[PDB]
Structures are given as C-alpha cells and as structure tokens.
Symmetry: D3
Subunit: 67 residues, 6 copies
C-alpha cells in the first residue's frame, strides 16, 4: 500500500532502548543520526534489532523548517 506520510527515510537501526511503554530507536541515515520514539509494542511487532534496514516515516505536517 502507498502511504500519505510524505517523508520516507531509508535508514539502518543502530541502537534500541526499551522502557515500560516507549522505545528509543536510534538510526543512521546517510551519515546523520535519527531518533524515533515509538511504543515497545511496535518494537516487538516489527521485531526490530540493531542492524535492521528500516524506513523512518514522517507526515509532512509534522516537519518544521529552520533557517
């Protein structure tokens, strides 16, 4: 299925820190570090581990611009 969220970032998982409800997913994206905060439920469902190839997704309305 196609997804409306416009920003797709093909990245690699570097580190995962699991809390009681949330998880920190640290990724590498063409040399830049990305940090996503998602539920532990999702970490389990996607079965994410360091080294995995993943797509970071961001809705256009959730992206700010700094200049």
């Amino acid at each position: 299925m196609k997804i409306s969220g416009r920003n797709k970032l093909e990245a690699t998982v570097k580190e995962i820190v699991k809390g009681t409800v949330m998880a920190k997913i640290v990724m590498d994206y063409k040399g830049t570090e990305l940090v996503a905060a998602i539920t532990i439920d999702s970490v389990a469902d996607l079965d994410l581990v360091p080294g995995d190839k993943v797509t970071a997704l961001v809705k256009a309305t959730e992206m700010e611009v700094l200049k």
Copy 2:
C-alpha cells in the same frame, strides 16, 4: 539555542507552493526528497525561497518506523 526535537536534516529548498494558510516546502536531503507543510506565516518570517539551505526538524515522537 539547543532544540529538543532530535531529528535535524540539513537540506536545500527546491520548491515552495503557497496556499491561503499552508505552504508546501519541497526540499532535497542528499538526493532524497522531503516535503514539509508549514504556515505561510513561517514562509514570510523566515523569508524562505528556492535554493535556501535549511534544517528540516522532526520531534522524536513524531517519527514512525516501518519494516
């Protein structure tokens, strides 16, 4: 200042489409196209124009992961 939003992507503005309230900011990040939807007020305040070097910003809690 330092910004809590963890995701910073250094990009270049390619195109700007202005609506009555919102604006579409199309950017290039190392060959990947990004799309941000912000207010026209921000386009005016930052004086965004095609070619500008900017930083796309995304809060960690607003980034999903797909696999």
Copy 3:
C-alpha cells in the same frame, strides 16, 4: 512492511476537498465520520477517489483520551 503507527482503521472515502496545499479526506468508519488533512500531493500519488477502501493511520503518541 509492518508500520509502527499502532492505530489502523479500515475505512471508505466519502468525499475529498482539494485546497492549494492541503486536502480534506472525509471517510466513513463503521458509521463514524473521520477527517484526515493530508497534502494534495498524497491525493495524487495514492489516486484517492470517493468510494476507495483505505486505512486511516494514527501514531499512538498522537492520540489523546477524553473522559
């Protein structure tokens, strides 16, 4: 691909209103009206039209609870 965003609602598009930058997607979910505001770019990419069966997607961290 599996998607971290935890909320998936299988819905049907009822109407689409296109602005210069954003589009209003009015959907029916088992009798409840849903409203998504996405970019016109996504309408074009997904080729969304009235009657389409789609999945409304919401990240867990973007859902409030009222009581």
Copy 4:
C-alpha cells in the same frame, strides 16, 4: 466544550500499562483495537481504569491515509 480535533472515537478502555512518564492505553473501538500513549499524569487525573467509556481524540492533521 466543542473540540477542533475532528476525530472522536468513542471507545472502551481494555488495559492500562504505566511507565515512569508515559502510559499505554489499550482500547476497543467498534471491534478494533486502539493504542494511545499519554502521560501517567493524565491516567491519574482522569482516573482511567478498564471498562471506562472514553473518547479517543485525533487531530485531522495527524491522521495519515494508506491505500
């Protein structure tokens, strides 16, 4: 009060998991499971417990469409 957030999902709380800062709220919505991640402060303020009839609320700009 009326609320601008367009998506009101009248649901029932099924389970609550409390972390140090965040809390996972699992709900049933017209036969489909929802998962919200809110602050533990809110769980305490709303006195949320299983069986509670609540409204899951999603802003239109925070709802993606997949097809």
Copy 5:
C-alpha cells in the same frame, strides 16, 4: 469531560484566516501571540469569532523545549 492533552491555554481569538481546507486561528495568550492551524470545518463547528474566549490545547508529546 477531562482531557489527557496536558497543555490548556485560556486565550482570546484575534484573527481567523480561512483557506479551502485549513484555517489559521491567531490568538492572544496573556500578551503572547499563538497560531493554530485547524480545519475550516472546525471554525464553523465551533463558530469561532474574533474576540471569543477559547482554550488552546496541546498534547504533552507535541511540545518541544528550547534552551
């Protein structure tokens, strides 16, 4: 009902700009200007008029900190 969204700002509507899909709601909050981007449908549903006393609402997870 009580609302999980933790940030409530009792403000006054200063200006409303209506687009095809979105509306800009400019508000005053104790001398500080606020700007919300909501759907035009919401302006009509709430029947917002400049001068009206309203509550600006922000989810805790959607608030960044700068220092």
Copy 6:
C-alpha cells in the same frame, strides 16, 4: 536560526521526571503549568534543570482550539 514552529512560550522549568526513554518537563508559563514529554536524550543535551529559563515550542498544526 528562525524556527517555523509558530508558538513560542517563554517559561521556567519547575520539575523534571526521567523515565527510561521519555522525560516529563513541568514548566511555569505566566502562572499556567505546562507539561512537555521529550526524550531523556534531550534533557541531557540541553542540560535541563529546575529553574532554567526555556522556550516551549509548538507547531501550529499541532495546536487544537476548544470552545
């Protein structure tokens, strides 16, 4: 740098609660309490502590209006 996020609230940190992944930042804004949920990574990066003068930041598209 200028920031597209339109809502800037000059506040003071009152309390910080650190979880495994997220942190609760309790602030005072001209007598009104604010609550932000950001990553513990940001608390460390910004060296946030009670008494700090900070700017709470909210994107226009993430602010709802209630009436």
